[PDB]
Symmetry: C3
Subunit: 454 residues, 3 copies
């Protein structure tokens, strides 16, 4: 067989598993070992977006699940525990396992129980693992996937950084960024119409203050998974190229590509060399996933600019929109305050400030000045102040035709923004009214609900 | 040109075509031949699922169509007959043909007619063929696709087994597993929202008693097609790895991969070596296709267990659901009896028994015992017996909150199962009521229709 | 770094950009140069289909945008101008640029403004460029994409022809071929449900009299882009094979394939050798895109037939439908005449003639004769003449069961054609009534609207 390195030697090894986006250290081993892996399923609510909760089903308390790292030819004794708070039974199918269901029949585990099976890791590569419990799509859609690396016997080449990034498609009953606890939506899932497409189980999980880091001249390896359940990723790095892309345990290695299709249930190892500083965006280049459903992650490179290679500026809110900033925690806070019935004007102002970036600032500017004759001002706007209810209609339904704002004629088009939720429109307009010498006061989510219903 | 092996020699050869999942024997030939291929289009109703009929349009009476096997450099005299029972005209486009439409203009054939064209097979590889008659998508959606292998002059390497598997997406007016003759649905097809995603033209075409077979240590080659019309397959083998994957006639060969994207209209040759016994599942890893729309096939390996490679059990209904069993013929029978107006309690019981596997048994167990305090019993259930109409609402709409069943409190969540058809809910509940000392009687499809409509 | 060819030498070069489907000449240069690229964004209405207008956002006035051709190691001084008629701000992200956003932050340009940034072209390959202005999906959906080729230092191998083809998915508020100015539809775009899938920004942009041309024995290189925003192309040539397919700047080259997946935001260079004359169709083999949404382009090869390679005929309306003919300009004219209120019978007749090809002619024949006993005649049809309102219902809703036409019984099935627009049904039936000794008169779009609404 392949991985014919003999029986296990040395001492039994208790695998150290890591949470995303971190990876266990290289096994750094010249002999096949008995590796004991202990993984516990936990069902729990987490924020899938600011002020949006979702009941995830997790291997090890994270989406994606704990990263497992073994050596080709190792004997793996796999212990799956199902936490007693669980409502569902669970199991595991690991890609790269030689045997029926990749462990599924022998790993079936009720709440409060433990299962074990043993396999030999014959196949070198990066592999998805996931729950295989009927209904399998519901389990995978709730977050039950991760990666197992089976190293070659000599190990992978040394790099400066190793990271763990996994795409998933998610199906909420509510629309994108609709606040509250969102149930799983079986109808959207069967139709392959996801509300969110995420890296590492949340909007902003790898943006702003949670970006991946490296320095100019350093090499970065990323273990990239696609848990699906349904989507194929047009996986892409903006402003850079992959030195290498290798799928699962394939003999084939692609070099010098920027865009690479990762199948549902697929995994790849990509290598990046940092050349110039700034934010490098990992996206699904099925572009409405990246810019409208959350499928964007950041590798931030620090070091000296090289103007002979690139004269341009760091990314800002024009491209990254409301994910240019370190975090959008003011949205989380304003959502919690609405639930408590303690929402203040300042709660709304700070939430609207976060949401205004890109969404509005691309045309009206970060300071609301616009561009005279081209984009009208929101700063000290006579037109805004004259009719706050008109302002709600303009955000939801757009505006075209001749208007006069602060003594100047405009004859342009503001597209409708009907996909913004009532709370988002209310908070954005409350921010504008309380900025730039505007008259103050507030717009409520309920005010916007009524304008939306006409 | 490529395939420059001279004029045909020897005697004219009448091609022996095979029905899926079988393949003609290797051509075993050192000279270029005139090969006469005779293929007849037949329009006919077949079961796309138990109790679900569909009017397929077929090359040779099967979906996929008859397998054609020739040698690179052969001259192929292609005869397409359209059976006189046909209502539509048909033609053929073969991938790997050098010339406009791959045969389409010269193979146009009305009902009761025959067409012929001649081509030289210049291009070695595995290739899709399909109907190219306006409207082309409707013809391909109805089943008009298959494979032609153009062997290299030296032939392919010897293997123990060669099989023929082809994915297709199907568009029925009714929902998945809705019984009766289902028309083609042009609106779903244009939207790329299929009701079924199948291997070899039916649910269960390659599961249970229709699984592919091999023995431990044997090599298996599978000629894998994607007829589409629309979907890209994340083609995957659960619990194994492909030794090799080669697309069409490509120079590139990928080795040691488990998951491989097959384009719409694409074909690949995959090679598998059997290492340990059990069921190896071929799926589209766009997971709701595999587990919710029918996209699963089985390679069953017999031979000795190797506990040093895999200690675990054969797949069961937890993973494979209602396709773990040899067949679901009791569903076909109960559907026919409903049509005839002769449906008995025992017809419903045997149909419900088949449908209970996975769907219900994953939590309630195959014997209905559940798990005390975790999953309540259906065996001798006081809660079930107290209100059969509540039971219908529980299956359709789910159940949460504190209940008491047979003296024990449960405080868990049963997800809704609204995608089950009225007949499926009726037959499942009739099985439960007539099992495990439950009070008997029956639930009708009409009973469930009324509860569904609230 | 890669592309380490030293500082720029010689004179500054003003890049000559080409409109699709043409490509600039090879750079034919042995030294690294300063290349000045001047690209202007223009927002303008164009015909996305006959009688269907759409407001495109373009780089250089075309979809795809102007083709840029430089050499690896060149220093590119990139000037982006936004025409003063523009309503939106715009920027550019070029794939293959080393730096944050691929130029996005430094190229942000309001209407009437100009931006510039400088980059070194370190990475050889074919690369997509596109707008990266919030909301990014809306900009790319409106047509803001093209290709930049970064040649290897030795240049690409010489070929007889180089062409420029780029797929895009488009989202109109109206249905496919619904006439008038069609707005962008954000809901369809977020759902990845396009109304059109096009090569080079229009139905028929590369069919009939706008086909690409070559001769038997000539080599053709096509630079193939997928601008998306959302779809992955199962990119395929009917009746031929690609000698080579190379993605972006990848080291991997696939040879001898017919079907190849191009990611959203991806690009490939394909090479074709012309062997026999006729029309070679480039399609997205997600077949309803190619045959129902416009995703078809033609390479027309002229030269001598080789009956030993292919005995068959050139493609006709059976396969290519209404795109077999040189153009469908009669539809454009009849749509303009409806708008003006000057639509004549002859305007409708010429439009219906164009639309009848394939749509109706596949069964009823180009001369309306049908096939006695199999497909009834439209020529001198007693059944058509007896009830013109029934004819409208037959096109919209189909026809089955026994009928008698011109003394012969038919017992067949005409599928419904409900996706045809009111104007298309009206014009097709007016063509039939005014042909083949039929009684004349006309059907109006309003007549069909009323029958459709029942
Ligand atoms: C893509 C450009 C663009 C974006 C994005 C945009 N606007 Fe506008 N907005 C305009 C233009 C142009 C006008 C003037 C329209 C006209 O000439 O009829 C306008 C007008 C307005 C007006 C009324 C005139 C004024 O200056 O007081 C308000 C209020 C406004 N926008 C608010 C917003 C808010 C809040 C956002 C984000 C939620 C937003 N806009 C996003 C372009 C934009
Ligand atoms: C994923 C788990 C799961 C699946 C699948 C499932 N159930 Fe349940 N079922 C439960 C749980 C948990 C409860 C108790 C809910 C509570 O605590 O409120 C339940 C309660 C019930 C009850 C009422 C209580 C009792 O024991 O009599 C019935 C009847 C029932 N299920 C039938 C079915 C049938 C029939 C199927 C399949 C069609 C099914 N269930 C599938 C978990 C499941
Ligand atoms: C795929 C085959 C097919 C296509 C495409 C088709 N038809 Fe028919 N058509 C038929 C058949 C078969 C019948 C007779 C149906 C029956 O036996 O009940 C028919 C009947 C008719 C009739 C009534 C009988 C007669 O001969 O006068 C009309 C009118 C007609 N078609 C018009 C059209 C028009 C206009 C188009 C295109 C818009 C069209 N058909 C496309 C197959 C087709
Ligand atoms: O680089 N494109 O998103
Ligand atoms: O192995 N996954 O379905
Ligand atoms: O060759 N198929 O469209
Ligand atoms: Cu699970
Ligand atoms: Cu056909
Ligand atoms: Cu733009």
């Amino acid at each position: 067989l392949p991985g014919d390195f003999g029986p296990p030697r040395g001492e039994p090894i208790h695998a150290v598993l890591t949470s995303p986006p971190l990876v266990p250290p290289p096994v750094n081993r010249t002999y096949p070992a008995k590796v004991i892996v202990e993984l516990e399923v936990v069902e729990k609510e987490m924020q899938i977006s600011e002020g949006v909760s979702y009941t995830f089903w997790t291997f090890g308390g994270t989406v994606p699940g704990s990263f497992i790292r073994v050596r080709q030819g190792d004997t793996v004794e796999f212990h799956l525990k199902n936490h007693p708070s669980s409502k569902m039974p669970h199991n595991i199918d690991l890609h790269g396992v030689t045997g029926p269901g990749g462990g599924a029949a022998s790993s079936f585990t009720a709440p409060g129980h433990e299962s074990q099976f043993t396999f030999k890791a014959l196949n070198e590569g990066i592999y998805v693992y996931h729950c295989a419990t009927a209904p399998v799509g519901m389990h995978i859609a709730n977050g039950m996937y991760g990666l197992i690396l089976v190293e070659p016997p000599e190990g992978l080449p040394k790099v400066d950084h190793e990271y763990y990034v996994m795409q998933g498609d998610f199906y909420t009953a509510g629309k994108y960024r609709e606040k509250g606890l969102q149930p799983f939506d079986m109808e959207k899932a069967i139709d392959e119409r996801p509300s969110y497409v995420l890296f590492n189980g949340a909007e902003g999980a790898l943006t702003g203050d949670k970006a991946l880091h490296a320095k100019v001249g350093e090499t970065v390896r990323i273990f990239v998974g696609n848990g699906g359940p349904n989507l194929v990723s047009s996986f892409h790095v903006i402003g850079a190229i992959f030195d290498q892309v290798r799928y699962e345990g394939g003999t084939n290695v692609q070099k010098n590509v920027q865009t690479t299709l990762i199948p549902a249930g697929g995994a790849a190892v990509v290598k990046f060399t940092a050349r110039v500083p700034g934010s490098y965006v990992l996206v699904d280049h099925s572009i409405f996933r990246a810019f409208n459903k959350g499928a964007m992650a950041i590798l931030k490179i620090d070091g000296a600019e090289n103007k002979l290679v690139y004269s341009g500026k760091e990314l800002d809110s024009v491209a990254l929109g409301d994910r240019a900033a370190p975090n959008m925690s003011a949205v989380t806070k304003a959502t919690q305050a609405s639930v408590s019935g303690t929402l203040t004007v300042q709660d709304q102002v700070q939430a609207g400030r976060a949401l205004f970036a890109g969404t509005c600032s691309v045309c009206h500017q970060g300071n609301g000045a616009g561009l005279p004759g081209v984009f009208p001002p929101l700063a000290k706007s006579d037109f805004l102040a004259a009719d706050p209810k008109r302002a709600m209609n303009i955000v939801l339904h757009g505006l075209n035709g001749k208007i006069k704002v602060n003594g100047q004629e405009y004859d342009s088009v503001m597209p409708p923004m009907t996909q913004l939720n009532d709370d988002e429109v209310a908070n954005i307009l409350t921010y504008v009214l309380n900025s730039w010498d505007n008259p103050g006061g507030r717009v409520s989510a309920e005010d916007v609900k009524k304008v939306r219903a006409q």
